Amino acid sequence: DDDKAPPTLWSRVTKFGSGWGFWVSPTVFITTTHVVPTGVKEFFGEPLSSIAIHQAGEFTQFRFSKKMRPDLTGMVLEEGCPEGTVCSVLIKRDSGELLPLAVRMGAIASMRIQGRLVHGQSGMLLTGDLGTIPGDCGAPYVHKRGNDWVVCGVHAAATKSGNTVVCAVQAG
């Protein structure tokens, strides 16, 4: 250790707009809506007409026609995790530092953050700055199930202390 997740899993975390996104598979990319660049004609060199985009409650998913990360296997994307589960936020910093932050997740709810409707899950950063920062949005919340890693949300918000975090999750 001490970075928990394997290099391939870290390599899914991708600088994007004013934050990050996550390659769930070679064709599917997820991120938090407010970090997505606007007024552009393409993402990762691909025209919009070759990308199926779904956005809701601060969760954004891109499905590319073209395989963009064929080095990856497909992962399960779940709608949040069970409450009470200790999950990890896979944070990359601009310096290159990797920071897997442990969080205990609570209830999935509709919240109103800074005027944006967030469909997501609150969680508590666990006692061990220590926490997330404004440039961290889009980092994935993950956990391991059997032998496989699963992703369940993307970083969207945190309270002023930083002790409470929220990930946006995909609606079913």
Side-chain angles (χ1 to χ4, degrees), residues 1-128 131-172:
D1 218 53
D2 62 351
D3 296 318
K4 188 171 111 306
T8 298
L9 179 47
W10 283 105
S11 81
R12 299 168 180 263
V13 184
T14 299
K15 188 68 185 84
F16 191 65
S18 67
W20 303 85
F22 185 77
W23 290 99
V24 177
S25 72
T27 55
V28 177
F29 185 73
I30 61 174
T31 185
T32 303
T33 306
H34 74 269
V35 315
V36 180
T38 62
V40 298
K41 304 177 194 205
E42 62 178 19
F43 290 111
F44 300 114
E46 293 291 301
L48 306 176
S49 68
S50 73
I51 313 172
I53 301 167
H54 294 90
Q55 310 192 113
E58 284 297 299
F59 191 94
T60 288
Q61 177 184 281
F62 289 161
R63 184 181 302 267
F64 295 79
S65 298
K66 183 195 226 134
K67 302 204 185 43
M68 305 303 292
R69 288 289 303 273
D71 62 292
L72 302 175
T73 64
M75 272 177 74
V76 171
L77 166 61
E78 269 165 20
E79 170 170 25
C81 51
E83 276 171 88
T85 303
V86 185
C87 296
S88 308
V89 188
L90 309 183
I91 291 173
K92 285 188 175 170
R93 288 290 159 71
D94 270 346
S95 70
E97 183 180 7
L98 309 179
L99 277 185
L101 298 186
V103 183
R104 192 183 306 264
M105 320 285 26
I108 295 187
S110 315
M111 305 164 260
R112 185 66 78 173
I113 295 182
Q114 280 174 299
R116 301 215 175 202
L117 175 66
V118 180
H119 177 71
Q121 202 164 6
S122 303
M124 299 286 269
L125 263 197
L126 301 184
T127 298
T132 58
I133 56 173
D136 287 343
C137 294
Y141 283 48
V142 304
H143 71 273
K144 194 154 176 222
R145 153 182 303 163
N147 305 305
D148 301 304
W149 290 94
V150 159
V151 57
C152 55
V154 287
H155 187 61
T159 59
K160 32 343 282 208
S161 72
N163 292 322
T164 301
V165 293
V166 173
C167 63
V169 305
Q170 187 176 66

